[PDB]
Write a protein that binds this DNA or RNA. Structure first.
Lengths: 156, 106, 227, 126
RNA sequence: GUUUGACCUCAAAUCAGGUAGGAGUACCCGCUGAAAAGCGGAGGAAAAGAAACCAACCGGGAUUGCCUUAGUAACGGCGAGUGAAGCGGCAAAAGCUCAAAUUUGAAAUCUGGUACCUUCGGUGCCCGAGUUGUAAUUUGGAGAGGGCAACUUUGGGGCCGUUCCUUGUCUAUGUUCCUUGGAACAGGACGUCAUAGAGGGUGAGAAUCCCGUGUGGCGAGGAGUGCGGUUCUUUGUAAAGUGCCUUCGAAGAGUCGAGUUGUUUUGCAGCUCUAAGUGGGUGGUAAAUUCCAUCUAAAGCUAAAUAUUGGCGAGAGACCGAUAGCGAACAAGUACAGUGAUGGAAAGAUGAAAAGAACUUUGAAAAGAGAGUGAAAAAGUACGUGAAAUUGUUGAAAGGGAAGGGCAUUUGAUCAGACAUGGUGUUUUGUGCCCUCUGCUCCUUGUGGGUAGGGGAAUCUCGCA
RNA sequence: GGACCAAGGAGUCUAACGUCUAUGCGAGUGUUUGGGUGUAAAACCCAUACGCGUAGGUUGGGGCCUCGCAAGAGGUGCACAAUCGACCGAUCCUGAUGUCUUCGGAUGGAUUUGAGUAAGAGCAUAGCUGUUGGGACCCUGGUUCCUGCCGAA
RNA sequence: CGUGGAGGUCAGUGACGAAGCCUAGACCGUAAGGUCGGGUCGAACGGCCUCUAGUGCAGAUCUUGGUGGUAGUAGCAAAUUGAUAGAAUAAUCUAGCGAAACCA
RNA sequence: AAACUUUCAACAACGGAUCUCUUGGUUCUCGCAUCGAUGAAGAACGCAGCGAAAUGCGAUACGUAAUGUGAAUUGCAGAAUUCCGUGAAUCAUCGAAUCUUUGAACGCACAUUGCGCCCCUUGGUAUUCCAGGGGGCAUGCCUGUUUGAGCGUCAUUU
């Protein structure tokens, strides 16, 4: 506060461009999945909240000590003295099949296949050595694949 | 002369990073799937360690491609070489266990 | 400031010994030794002649160490928890703390340390259920999980025996936290440390029977002046 | 106590905020509590005072006096109420600069901005 | 053909569109360099960074930074002392792009202009650029051509939310009685709130007077693809991936290196010389006409972990409290000084409110005196408080060219000097926790504690009077 | 060396070894690079590494026991010291059984050796202090409270 | 013994007067010093157990500030539309202004 | 004896020490990344009803417009608010303008208030002449458009 700039900006009639950030940098929204956004708690931690989920937070070998957090009573050894839920929800969601579309055929090339289907029929060695309407000289079996896709699409 | 007065502070900031990054990576872990790799240097040759990445051939032995495996969060090193049997097999079992526990969204 | 005549004796000159940052601020402590200090503080909190010896208004409380049910943890409103401590009988300690608010005599009054007052009860919980918000507004009360048990909160001003209130589950959990001869420790390689003397009373040992058998007869306990 | 980090509790910062406050913030600072009757009227405790309304004095040496505010002297964090004056030895008159924390508003001067403000503060405005 | 035209080069444009400079410079990167200064260049970081690496192991695996290695190795009139690195643990993690063989069944590429459109752009048309090579595909971890078998996959918008930023607004409880005070925010009694008893203001220490504080709520305007729903379309023999088979299967040269010189402590630079392709680099290894290891130099980009006495903001302090703390709490880099480069002070507090002394009078004028305000001018814009050195007057004493203290005592002056006023025994009368009778109640349940009603001192007895 | 007076004004901090003392643990010890946690620069918990250390006799003799009323006598003997030993390493000779013609050390000597074996003591923190270096008490001169005890050359 | 600050405590003191100042006022301490009276004064401050230090001054021709004597002296631009005036003829006195050196 | 000197006390001076505050430093931590030829920083000159510094502004000059709030400002003077509002305010916010002369400083010059050139507009008798107003005109570099030039090269009888 002893630079000439800071003193002038202090004495100026502008006022400081003041923005407060330090409160809101601790809290974060998770932004990504609404399911985790539901089960997120903003209180436990990244670590405790992932543990309460059931998802493995860090992959492997944390430095330091985890909270063993006193789940059980451990008794001394005598030395022989003398006498899941949200996991299930995401598992359903990933298990949920998406509404997929079959990759269809284009009208010109299925018409081309339709020309081949009437010109040669079904046999492939004749249509492979056909010049007219096989000018791209398609592969022996690519012909089969496209014709079987066309037949399953149309014409049995 | 420098004193780490910010040692308490930076850790907080670092966990803020470990918070904030985690916010973007919300289901996924922060870290990738790293190999378990035995160390060099006879002082340390009994020690096993976290390695950088597995190999191409090992990920193929796991039954997937490394280009796809980077999307699954499996760290892959091409320039490493697999030369020990038990290292290879244990890391394959590690890959299989990682495959068992993931669920991938389409 | 670094560079900011030239004499320590001079007006406006540089001072003798410019105070530098790299003077030691934090002090390294052996971990067993720190745990030992906390253990002695916890053991001292039971006694309550020590708690009166520090200064607390605990003369009308049910017993020592004072243990309340775990339901105390489930209180989430200030007035209910204060009424609960009335029902305990630590009301006089709270009134002591509330009357004790004085202004700081130093210059540090205008260094954001303006007010000072005594310390009161310490509530120990196993688990928060809104209790720490409820007791936050009442002065002098400070809460602590059994896992932490802050020494500064335990023996403030290095005086042993602050007045400590326990919840029921926390009091059971203290066995988990420090272990015993039966329960292990829950701390890695820690043992509740031993005594060098078993009996705490020396005058009991001196006046027992058998030392009193083995010992020669005593003098007048003040010397008879001769000549 | 102070829970947000963005709130500060420095005495020096707080006084530098107080004495260098712009006037629009000052009329928020220059606030007076309503009467028990006006709280029974509108359901609201304190309000930013202006000059048109009527007030009573509840502290100070001129305690138990009342009047309409002559002018709000916002630059001195103060408020001149009419007819509460010191009469000098020339015979002239100068009002006591009162402070709205020591005042209790008796009769409000209601305006559309004022009625909407009472509405937004939860008032049961007639 | 003495003509005409392609180019190519070079000019010119008050042609169109862009861009460079300077300031600052804490951190960063280069260059220069003494007994640091300087120069140049950037950014929010920069640099470095995906091995021509480290190792010798059961090998590791971009860079960066921390701890350890370690004050070790090594160096050094092996003197002064100088002074690493591998590994390990951690933080952070991320990888990619060119240059080499043809798309030749069609330069498939892009700037610009213009016309429109849903404009960080799109479409169309037209000039150009470009084969002395712009696109697609391929960077060794290969890859490409095909073929086979299958599978597996599709892209682009919108909108509304969400997320982020910038804001706006709402969200408790005494001003209850008494004393003191100029002023209650002080003291006492009785309260209420509290996820709010941080802080500040209000005429003195204010949870409850005000602002806030705390908890939540409602908005507003943007940023945005981060994802979440809806909605509109998207195929064209389009693009890609995996296994097997077949045929191929091209990479950084004035560089590597060598000598010398300077410089550094081995690199770098200059000068001269200057390569290879089962190549080259680097290191161990030997039972030796050795074997083995490990990378691919001479092209490029890359977040994060990192530095930051600067900027923009915050939040704090076992810091200083006006000779301190910044030179500077104040109209401080000021007044001032210097020709200049530059140097560089002193200086905070009336009061709660100016209520800042109406009016009379002396007085050139300055200053007074009456008077008054104020709680206080023992606060009068010379102003909180107001020490010492030093000054003036009065009083006392001493001295006469006398200096100071120590002891001890007079004399003179002077001060202090009970809120002391009771105890023991006896006696009179009266009263009650005394006596008697009748209770109630708390537990620590006894060698207890509290408490009521009526009667009596006629007799006794205790305490009190 | 001095006109007076007021205020300011001179052994501070840090690093490396060293003694002493206190404290915790103990052949181990050391949380705080870092991670987890939190009421948030506090406290609390700690994985893997790392650091430093670890890896016979005689004479007495504190005591203790017995006896002795006591005085004393006898016995067992802490620490430590002296002796005589032993062994390891070295020392210089012996040079075998074997021996690749120069390999070998077997055995026996000899003195000393050594923070040697012959049954650990260290690590960490704090305090006070010693030496050295950072401006290092301040600028030859100066160098800030009292009392007690010890007190030279 | 004393000083600034810090933790605890005395439900310490305080506008019916804290702190500070003065005190030919008393008291306790061997002393360092401490306690009270009175006066002034106006808003904070102490005792105890601990922590911490920018912690104790007569000197350093120490630093800064204030005030002396020198001294009403030197002397009169020594700092102050234009210039010390007055008188001595327009060639010593009064008046006004007024130092410094130095100072167990 | 007075006067003078010394000492002490009283009151009054002088002085600013002490005490108490403090919109000031000082240090630490956290976040952010943002100056220019679309003219920076810096300088100069002015702007307020009555201003010296401080701040703010640029001849639209302690400001204009916009948005929000909702009655002020205040040393004096003076407007007001039709007040249930298109509304004071030295208010806040600020995204649209203005922005004097310089300054990387940019028409050429410069010890000049020297000398221009081009374009647009208006008027003064206006076809000539003059006046006014407005806007451009620095260097380097890149890409493109346009105009040339070269004894550079080549072609040139279907």
């Amino acid at each position: 506060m002893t630079s000439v700039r800071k003193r002038k900006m202090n004495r100026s009639s502008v006022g400081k461009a003041t923005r407060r950030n330090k409160d809101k940098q601790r809290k974060i929204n998770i932004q990504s999945n609404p399911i985790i956004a539901a089960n997120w708690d903003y209180s436990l931690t990244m670590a405790q909240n992932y543990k309460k989920l059931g998802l493995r937070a860090k992959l492997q070998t944390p430095a330091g000590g985890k909270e063993a957090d006193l789940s059980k009573v451990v008794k001394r050894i005598p030395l022989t003295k003398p006498v899941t839920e949200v996991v299930k929800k995401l598992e359903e969601l990933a298990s949920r099949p998406v509404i997929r579309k079959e990759r269809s055929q284009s009208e010109r090339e299925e018409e081309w296949l339709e020309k081949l289907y009437k010109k040669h029929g079904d046999d492939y060695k004749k249509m492979f050595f056909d010049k007219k309407l096989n000018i791209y000289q398609q592969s022996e079996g690519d012909l089969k694949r496209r014709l079987l896709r066309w037949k399953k699409r149309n014409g049995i | 002369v420098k004193v780490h007065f910010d040692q308490a502070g930076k850790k907080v900031s670092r966990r803020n990073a470990r918070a904030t990054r985690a916010a973007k990576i919300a289901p996924r872990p922060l870290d990738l799937l790293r190999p378990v790799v035995r160390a060099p240097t006879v002082k340390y040759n009994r020690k096993v360690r976290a390695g950088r990445g597995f190999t191409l051939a090992e990920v193929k032995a796991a039954g997937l491609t490394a280009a796809y495996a980077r999307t699954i969060g499996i760290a892959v090193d091409h320039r490493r070489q697999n030369r020990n049997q038990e290292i290879f097999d244990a890391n394959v079992q590690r890959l299989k266990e990682y495959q068992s526990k993931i669920i991938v969204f389409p | 400031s670094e560079k900011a005549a030239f004499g320590n004796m001079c007006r406006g000159g540089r001072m003798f010994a410019p105070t530098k940052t790299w003077r030691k601020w934090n002090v390294k402590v052996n971990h067993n030794e720190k745990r030992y200090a906390t253990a002695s503080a916890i053991a001292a909190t039971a006694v309550a002649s020590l708690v009166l010896a520090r200064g607390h208004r605990v003369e009308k409380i049910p017993e020592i160490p004072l243990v309340v049910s775990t339901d105390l943890e489930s209180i989430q409103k200030t007035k209910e928890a204060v009424a609960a401590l009335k029902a305990v009988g630590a009301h006089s300690d709270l009134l002591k703390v509330l009357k004790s608010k004085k202004l700081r005599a130093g210059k540090g009054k205008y260094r954001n340390r303006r007010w000072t007052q005594r310390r009161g009860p310490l509530v120990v919980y196993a688990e928060d259920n809104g209790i720490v918000k409820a007791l936050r507004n009442v002065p002098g009360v400070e809460t602590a999980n059994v896992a932490s048990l802050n020494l500064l909160q335990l023996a403030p001003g290095a005086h042993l025996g602050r007045f400590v209130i326990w919840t029921e589950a926390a009091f059971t959990k203290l066995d988990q936290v420090w272990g015993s001869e039966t329960v292990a420790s829950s701390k890695v390689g820690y043992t509740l440390p031993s005594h060098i003397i078993s009996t705490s009373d020396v005058t009991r040992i001196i006046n027992s029977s058998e030392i009193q058998s083995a010992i020669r007869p005593a003098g007048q306990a003040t010397q008879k002046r001769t000549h | 106590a102070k829970q947000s980090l963005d709130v500060s509790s420095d005495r020096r910062k707080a006084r530098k905020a107080y004495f260098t406050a712009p006037s629009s913030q000052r009329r928020v600072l220059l606030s007076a509590p309503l009467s028990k009757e006006l709280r029974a009227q509108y359901g609201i405790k304190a309000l930013p005072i202006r000059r048109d309304d009527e007030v009573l004095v509840v502290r100070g040496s001129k305690k138990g006096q009342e009047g309409k505010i002559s002018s709000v002297y916002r630059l001195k964090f103060a408020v001149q109420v009419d007819k509460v004056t010191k009469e000098k030895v020339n015979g002239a008159s100068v009002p006591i600069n009162l402070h709205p924390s020591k005042l209790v508003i008796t009769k409000l001067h209601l305006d559309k901005d004022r009625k909407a403000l009472i509405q937004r503060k939860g008032g049961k405005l007639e």
